[PDB]
Design a binder for this molecule. Structure first.
Ligand SMILES: CCCCCCCCCCCCCCCCCC(=O)OC[C@H](CO[C@@H]1O[C@H](CO)[C@H](O)[C@H](O)[C@H]1O)OC(=O)CCCCCCCCCCCCCCCCC
Ligand SMILES: CCCCCCCCCCCCCCCCCC(=O)OC[C@H](CO[C@@H]1O[C@H](CO)[C@H](O)[C@H](O)[C@H]1O)OC(=O)CCCCCCCCCCCCCCCCC
Ligand SMILES: CCCCCCCCCCCCCCCCCC(=O)OC[C@H](CO[C@@H]1O[C@H](CO)[C@H](O)[C@H](O)[C@H]1O)OC(=O)CCCCCCCCCCCCCCCCC
Ligand SMILES: CCCCCCCCCCCCCCCCCC(=O)OC[C@H](CO[C@@H]1O[C@H](CO)[C@H](O)[C@H](O)[C@H]1O)OC(=O)CCCCCCCCCCCCCCCCC
Lengths: 90, 195, 60, 69, 49, 48, 105, 418, 164, 179, 115
């Protein structure tokens, strides 16, 4: 008997496009890496790095804008409300 | 009976229907917007102060008069300086009233290796920008020192991007002739690079 | 059209890449494992797992 | 009103070069489409403020100070 | 109370990555020199930092 | 009134519509209470 | 089958819970396919793209199940027009094509 | 759109903070300046053809393995990996596609839609030539749309499909004008311009979205497809051209043959059924009141075809989508002036309301309606009218809002004597 | 006798007077909107109209007397505007007849879902009549309702000579 | 009076039960242990009001969640990809852009069984999680030489043939207490 | 007996009768799918996304067989040339694709429940 009880399958959807090395029209399941999807685009030989699509920091105005939309929140802003600060340090 | 006459008559009928429906919707929108003011005036009558409601109505007329005086003619209308100081914008509150400890840059929590200078560079780039600080001009952050700090932390991603850049051009053996690339190939993969 | 899960997929040709057919066999194996948990035989054959289970139920 | 306002608002090429060269570091026709419109708007807003200051506000400030509430 | 849902939203009056930063906040603005003091229309209710 | 709300004379039209709807399924899909109990028992013994 | 009033009210309650459902199914590559309201499910059933053994998910379930084992899905799908058109498509389009593709390869 | 122009204006005013700050967002000089500039550029682009010089298409380039999802690539017992890649690839097939085209054309002309009803009304109330031109109009419009899909003419198909609300309004205007013309029972003989009118009506109705009565039968096709609009596998360019041309010619030949059969049926066999109804039936009806109820039945059927899509869509999709909004847009929930919890835009405040949202009719001083169904839940909007997958339930349960005796018992103040 | 067309202020006044029967049936909207959510905007549109038509108990009787004595009999006003005013009054009377009918239902029917169907049909029928008449009022045309519009024509030609 | 002359104290008011993973409970019905979950917020508790929903979320930091949700909270099964910030109860220094967790979620935390994968460092962990914090038995692999050689244009079969033995010799199997 | 000046159009009572009966019948036909002589009432023949996907399929296949690199045509529009976010660059096609579920419809319940 095998170690696996269920089979591990790749679970990626397919799409059509040009291959540039085979030089052919191809159906494939090769998508762009998640390490750089959303950060950059290449619509020319030159590359555009986008300036604000992931937020990389937060102040009180932008925290008030995105208060119920974040996956986390830190102590750094929540010091200044006493019930929240008691939740962090009981 | 010609096609042109039928299209023009259809166009005129559609225009008159749409214009009258838009006028009805504009009146209904005004009637939805202004209900609270009429309700407060009616409550001021019904509480037992019938003379103060006329003051509210003529105050609305006098507010229209004051708007005409201030905006078209341009007169001072004294007391406006005390009204201007009562309110402020969000970025002005950030410039004047907030501590620097109420802003962070996601990388002072992620990297423990950061010095104080890289910490304030990340703070000025991502936490409080040049419009959110008092003595802040555009171009405060260099974005070349920031790239150097972002390459010092996680250097292998920078190596991967350098490889992709050299492969897009024709400088691949110029990539491999850098003084550390063969050594890090030897360290990661336990055999020397045959190719 | 070979990817369609109904009768329309069965009458169409799978390409001759061996790794793709390996993947299709694995997906079908997982689907059969899901199917066996909800669909049962009325009269199970002696020597099978369901026959053993039914014998224990009757004994209980 | 639309054409009469557009005579006041719409700037010429020298205002657009002037509004581009101080807001941005670059001369025009070297910009993204969204950042050309900022220079055009700044030139038009400067024209509007200048017109209001020299042609409407030069003679309406005779100080009839009254009519408070 | 009806509890609030933590779903990210789309649209708005801004392009993504920005917030409304000319929004009016009831909070005063102090000039550098005060003389013949009277009062403030909008007060600073929480004074310590 | 909760008991009177569900009397058959008050639910008659519903009894027509469901009788159409449930008859669109294959006949072998109808099960006895003993059969559904037995199938539940077989499911968790197969898990063991 | 003679149903009790208890069974009638249970079917009606389940129909109330399932009125607004949007369905999804998996294909032979374990890839989920598009948003399926009930009429899209009927079109896919008539065309032969799905059948009663296809894995489905909707509200009320934790995991993906074959369509025959999901309660009330098949009575919702199997309209008389759907049954007639499914029989027409199976008899005169897909089975001759299956015999042709068995003989040709 | 309008929302995109507002976003661009807000971006400009945020840029102007470092140079010349504004008083507020709605300062009159800046708003007037931007309005003049934007309407000037809109008219400049409208005198041009903005659907002609813009970019609608992109090339698709597949990433190599070094740039792909590296953690998803696994090697299975050596020599295999799961990064899949495959190509899409006598005169009997030409004849086969011709015959399949004839059968699928037979599937096209089943009388289940709006245009077939208009053609039948022109065959009955008016002469043979009127019905012939109506049928020719549906044939030509269906052929143009089908050939555009088969041959892959995206320059027409995709910009035309992008204007969806305009297509819906065009269908409404055409049907309402036809209903008003048909309600006046006008009767000339037949002239060339009046011949071209009815052809143009059925041709233009073929390009819109219309109602159907037997959609699963009508969308059946011979062959392994979900519709009659899917292509065939071919090996090179002339095989593509010949195979799809043969299929299109089969569609055309079958459609013209069915039109000739319809004309032949409406010349002589129709009068046999007509005299069987009007003389051999035991019912006693005149010939001037049978036509009256026939005209009313045709009017009722085409009015139902014009009305049916109105409960189908909400006002979000038909109104706020052309404005430029997305579903559950952030400006539908934006409140004005922090300390005030009321919505900034009251014109769309009805969209996406929870049952636990407060009702505004309970404010003091308001002489609103009496709502006896809500008297025991008076602080909330105590009904559930939710859509696709947007239902939210917090201490007002699903059963209390819309099930059985719980819902019935909560609304008992409707049925007090007074 | 004025035979001219309607102009826009008469259209606006007639639209408000057509909002009156919607105000009189707007309680029963929930029994229709529950089944067809696309019409949920009809739950919220008429709220300030409900407020202003109930400022006093004697307000709608005053409105009916004022419109009948000052618009319908006045021959200088164009005939189609008087037609639309009398149509609004007749639709109001039809809605009040429906209210009288729903307040005399027996107690056995009132505790069944048949009452829910009756409420939904009340709202939907008045809403359909109002939408149809508002469409033809914004066009500026005559619209003929069966069993209603002939009485409207007779009442106009009766109110006219209501002097000699 | 039952409604106005009685108030609940803070320490004696009713709350839903905490059951954790849900194992080891006493079954009221021996044939149906799930019936014992009915007083809790466990993801398999029967009839929790609103249905469990298929959520696809993109957060402003570009963390994404895909999977089952309860009242918009990730609470069943699914996949979380990490953006510039963090998620699933992980600490901020653990994740990088493009890392992945797959497995069980309760109340927004990684809780139960799962797999953590990082493309940037090559670390793989398979095993148990308690409140996002790596608790119980686990297996750790370093897949960095294979990933490194794949990023420099080596086809995967040749890369696996070069790196598989050194990857297999360095597998670690351990017990973790709290991270 | 006086109706009007006859230069202002009069709509007949048959128009309202057809409108009234057609609205009520459309509502009843939407509530009961499967009972319209065994059928139901649809408001379109083909999904626009389905039609566009077929047209893109044939277009790129014809482009590939002619020896060129194929192009995908996007519903809503192509990209904007910006540099601040990916979502702003691809806003028009994203706006088309976000409206998928209400474009498919319907906005009323798909199955009948008896209250
Ligand atoms: C944009 C969407 C709104 C467009 C609406 C259609 C534009 C109206 C054109 C009218 C016009 O004058 O056309 C001009 C034509 C001619 O209309 C009249 O016709 C008379 C004899 O034909 C004389 O020629 C008159 O001079 C001419 O004015 O009008 C029509 O043919 C269309 C009339 C539309 C009437 C509605 C009939 C359908 C009733 C359905 C019930 C709707 C109820 C509301 C439901 C919602
Ligand atoms: C494609 C071309 C089409 C024409 C282009 C028309 C676009 C016109 C641009 C107008 C810009 C209006 C300013 C928007 C300010 C929003 C700023 C914001 O943060 O909101 C925030 C502000 C509220 O914010 C507060 O407002 C206070 C005012 O009391 C303060 O003064 C400050 O503004 C602010 O603190 O919201 C608004 O004021 C509500 C506006 C919502 C509606 C947007 C304008 C829509 C009007 C367009 C109608 C014109 C249609 C013409 C069509 C012609 C083509 C056929
Ligand atoms: C309050 C004041 C109301 C004033 C009365 C004016 C009525 C004008 C409404 C025109 C409707 C129209 O053009 O859109 C009805 C048409 C539907 O039209 C149908 O559409 C189909 C497409 O699926 C096909 O094109 C059909 O040919 C076409 O007839 O919708 C559209 O064209 C979309 C445009 C946006 C319309 C939103 C307005 C509708 C909201 C008003 C609803 C009230 C109607 C109640 C009627 C009950 C019917 C069940
Ligand atoms: C860029 C800025 C974004 C702005 C987006 C603007 C959306 C514009 C929608 C405009 C349509 C609304 C009309 C204004 C309603 C006036 C009354 C109002 O404010 O009510 C305001 C009410 C909302 O009511 C509010 O509700 C709140 C609930 O939270 C509270 O109860 C408040 O007290 C109450 O005021 O809204 C309506 O009832 C909306 C009804 C709109 C439907 C009218 C049917 C007619 C539809 C148009 C017909 C088109 C015909 C085809 C034409 C062809 C051309 C396409």
């Amino acid at each position: 008997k095998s170690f696996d009880i269920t089979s591990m399958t790749t679970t990626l959807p397919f799409y059509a496009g040009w291959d540039e090395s085979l030089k052919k029209f191809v159906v494939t399941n090769r998508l762009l890496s998640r390490r750089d999807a959303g950060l950059s685009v290449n619509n020319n030989p030159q590359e555009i790095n986008f300036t604000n699509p992931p937020i990389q920091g937060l102040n009180e105005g932008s925290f008030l804008y995105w208060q119920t939309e974040m996956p986390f929140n830190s102590y750094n802003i929540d010091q200044f409300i006493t019930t929240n600060q008691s939740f962090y340090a009981p | 009976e010609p096609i042109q006459d039928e299209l023009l008559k259809l166009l005129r009928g559609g225009w008159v229907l749409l214009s009258n429906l838009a006028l009805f919707l504009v009146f209904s929108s005004f009637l939805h917007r202004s209900l609270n003011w009429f309700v407060q005036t009616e409550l001021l009558v019904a509480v037992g102060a019938p003379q103060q409601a006329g003051e509210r109505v003529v105050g609305k007329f006098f507010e229209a008069i004051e708007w005409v005086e201030r905006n078209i003619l341009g007169w001072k209308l004294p007391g406006d300086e005390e009204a201007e100081d009562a309110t402020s914008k969000v970025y002005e509150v950030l410039q004047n009233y907030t501590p620097a400890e109420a802003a962070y840059s996601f990388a002072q929590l992620k990297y423990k290796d950061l010095t104080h200078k890289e910490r304030e560079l990340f703070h000025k780039a991502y936490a409080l920008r040049h419009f959110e600080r008092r003595d802040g001009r555009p171009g405060d952050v260099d974005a070349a020192e920031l790239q150097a700090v972002k390459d010092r932390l996680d250097p292998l991603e920078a190596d991967r991007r350098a490889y992709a850049a050299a492969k897009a051009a024709g400088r691949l053996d110029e990539y491999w002739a850098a003084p550390g690339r063969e050594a890090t190939y030897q360290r990661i993969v336990g055999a020397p690079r045959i190719a | 059209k070979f990817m369609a899960p109904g009768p329309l997929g069965l009458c169409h040709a799978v390409p001759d890449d061996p790794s793709l057919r390996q993947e299709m066999a694995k997906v079908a194996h997982n689907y059969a494992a899901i199917y066996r948990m909800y669909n049962f035989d009325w009269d199970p054959e002696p020597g099978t797992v369901q026959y053993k289970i039914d014998q224990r139920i009757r004994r209980a | 009103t639309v054409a009469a306002g557009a005579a006041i608002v719409v700037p010429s090429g020298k205002q657009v070069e002037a509004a581009s060269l101080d807001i941005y570091g670059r001369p025009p026709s070297q910009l993204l489409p969204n950042e050309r419109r900022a220079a055009e708007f700044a030139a038009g807003h400067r024209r509007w403020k200048g017109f209001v200051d020299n042609s409407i506000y030069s003679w309406t400030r005779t100080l009839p100070g009254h009519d408070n509430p | 109370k009806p509890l609030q849902r933590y779903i990210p939203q789309n649209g708005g009056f801004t392009w993504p990555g920005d917030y409304l930063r000319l929004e009016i906040v009831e909070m005063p603005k102090l000039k550098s020199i005060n003389i013949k003091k009277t009062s403030l229309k909008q007060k600073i209710n929480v004074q310590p930092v | 009134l909760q008991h009177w709300y569900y009397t058959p004379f008050n639910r008659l039209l519903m009894k027509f519509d469901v009788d159409a709807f449930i008859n669109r399924q294959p006949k072998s899909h109808f099960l006895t209470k003993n059969e559904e109990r037995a199938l539940h028992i077989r499911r968790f013994l197969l898990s063991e | 089958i003679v149903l009790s009033p208890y069974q009638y009210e249970m079917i009606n309650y389940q129909r109330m819970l399932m009125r607004k459902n949007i369905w999804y199914y998996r294909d032979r590559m374990n890839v989920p396919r598009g948003p399926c309201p009930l009429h899209v499910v009927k079109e896919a059933w008539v065309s032969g793209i799905v059948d009663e053994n296809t894995l489905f998910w909707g509200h009320g379930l934790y995991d993906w199940l074959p369509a025959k084992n999901i309660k009330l899905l098949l009575p919702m799908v199997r309209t008389p027009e759907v049954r007639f058109a499914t029989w027409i498509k199976r008899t005169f389009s897909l089975k001759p094509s299956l015999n042709r593709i068995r003989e040709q390869r | 759109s309008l929302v995109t122009s507002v976003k661009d204006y807000v971006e400009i005013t945020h840029k102007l903070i470092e140079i010349e700050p504004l008083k507020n967002y709605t300062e009159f000089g800046a708003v007037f300046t931007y309005f003049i500039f934007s309407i000037g550029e809109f008219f400049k682009n409208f005198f041009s053809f903005s659907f002609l010089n813009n970019i609608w298409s992109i090339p698709i380039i597949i990433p190599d393995i070094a740039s792909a999802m590296i953690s998803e690539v696994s090697v299975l017992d050596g020599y295999f990996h799961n990064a899949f890649t495959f190509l899409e690839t006598p005169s009997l097939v030409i004849f086969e596609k011709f015959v399949i085209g004839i059968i699928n054309s037979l599937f096209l002309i089943l009388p289940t839609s709006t245009s077939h009803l208009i053609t039948l009304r022109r065959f009955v109330m008016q002469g043979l030539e009127a019905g012939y031109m109506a049928g020719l109009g549906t044939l030509a419009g269906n052929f143009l749309w089908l050939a555009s899909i088969i041959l892959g003419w995206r320059f027409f198909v995709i910009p035309w499909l992008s204007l969806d609300i305009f297509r819906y309004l065009l269908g409404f205007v055409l049907l309402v004008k036809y209903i008003w013309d048909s309600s006046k029972e006008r009767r000339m003989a037949l002239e060339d311009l009046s011949k071209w009118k009815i052809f143009l009506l059925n041709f233009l109705l073929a390009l819109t979205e219309q109602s159907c009565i037997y959609p699963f039968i009508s969308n059946l096709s011979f062959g392994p497809d979900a519709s009659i609009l899917e292509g065939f596998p071919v090996d090179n360019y002339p095989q593509f051209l010949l195979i799809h041309g043969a299929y299109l010619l089969g569609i055309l030949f079958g459609s013209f043959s069915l039109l000739q059969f319809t004309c032949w049926f409406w010349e002589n066999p129709a009068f046999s059924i007509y005299l069987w109804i009007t003389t051999k039936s035991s019912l006693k009806i005149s010939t001037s009141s049978y036509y009256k109820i026939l005209n009313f039945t045709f009017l009722y059927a085409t009015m139902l075809c014009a009305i049916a899509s109105i409960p189908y869509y909400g006002l979000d999709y038909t109104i706020t989508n052309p404005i430029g909004l997305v579903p559950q847009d952030r400006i539908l929930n934006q409140k004005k002036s922090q300390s005030d919890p009321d919505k900034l835009i009251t014109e769309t405040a009805f969209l996406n309301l929870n049952p636990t949202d407060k009702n505004s009719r309970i404010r003091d001083g308001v002489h609103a309606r009496r709502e006896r169904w809500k008297q025991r839940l008076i602080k909330y909007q105590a009904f559930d009218a939710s859509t696709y997958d947007q239902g939210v339930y917090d201490f007002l349960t699903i059963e209390d809002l819309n099930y059985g005796f719980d819902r019935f018992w909560l609304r008992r103040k409707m049925r007090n004597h007074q | 006798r004025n035979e001219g067309p309607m102009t826009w202020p008469w259209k606006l006044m007639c639209a408000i007077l057509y909002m009156l029967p919607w105000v009189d049936v707007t309680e029963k909207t929930v029994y229709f909107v529950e089944r067809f959510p696309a019409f949920v905007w009809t739950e919220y549109f008429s709220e300030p109209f409900e407020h202003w038509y109930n400022i006093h108990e004697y307000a709608p009787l005053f409105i009916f007397f004022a419109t009948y004595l000052g618009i319908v009999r006045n021959k200088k006003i164009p005939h189609v505007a008087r037609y639309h005013v009398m149509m609004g009054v007749m639709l109001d009377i039809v809605a009040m007849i429906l209210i009288v009918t729903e307040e005399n239902l027996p107690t056995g029917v009132l505790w069944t879902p048949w009452s829910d169907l009756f409420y939904a049909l009340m709202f939907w029928f008045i809403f359909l009549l109002v939408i149809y008449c508002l469409f033809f009022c914004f066009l500026g045309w005559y619209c003929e309702i069966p069993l209603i519009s002939e009485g409207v024509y007779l009442q106009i030609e009766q109110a006219e000579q209501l002097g000699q | 009076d039952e409604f106005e002359s009685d108030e609940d104290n803070t320490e004696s008011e009713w709350a839903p039960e905490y059951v954790g993973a849900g194992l080891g409970l006493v079954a009221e019905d021996p044939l149906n242990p799930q019936y014992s979950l009915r007083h809790s917020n466990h993801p398999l508790a029967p009839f929790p009001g609103e249905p469990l929903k298929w959520a696809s979320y993109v957060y402003p930091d570009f963390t994404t969640f895909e999977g089952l949700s309860k009242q918009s909270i990730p609470h069943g099964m699914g996949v979380m990809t990490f953006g510039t910030g963090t998620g699933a109860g992980f600490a901020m220094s653990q994740t990088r852009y493009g890392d992945k967790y797959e497995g069980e979620f309760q109340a927004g935390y990684a809780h139960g069984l799962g797999q953590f994968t990082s493309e940037a460092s090559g670390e793989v962990y398979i095993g148990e999680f308690f409140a996002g914090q790596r608790h119980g038995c686990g297996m750790t692999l370093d897949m960095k030489p294979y990933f490194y050689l794949l990023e420099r244009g080596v086809d995967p079969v040749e890369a696996y043939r070069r790196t598989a033995g050194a990857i297999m010799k360095n597998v670690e199997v351990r017990t973790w207490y709290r991270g | 007996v006086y109706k009007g000046p006859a230069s202002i159009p009069h709509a007949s009572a048959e128009v309202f009768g057809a409108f009234f009966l057609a609205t009520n019948t459309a509502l009843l036909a939407h509530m009961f799918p499967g009972k319209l002589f065994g059928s139901e009432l649809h408001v379109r023949k083909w999904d626009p996304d389905y039609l566009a996907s077929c047209c893109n399929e044939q277009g790129m296949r014809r482009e590939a067989l002619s020896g060129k690199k194929p192009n995908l045509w996007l519903l809503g529009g192509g990209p904007r040339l910006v540099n601040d976010s990916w979502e702003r660059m691809w806003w028009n096609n994203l706006h088309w694709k976000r409206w998928k579920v209400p474009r498919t419809g319907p906005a009323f319940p798909q199955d009948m429940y008896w209250q």
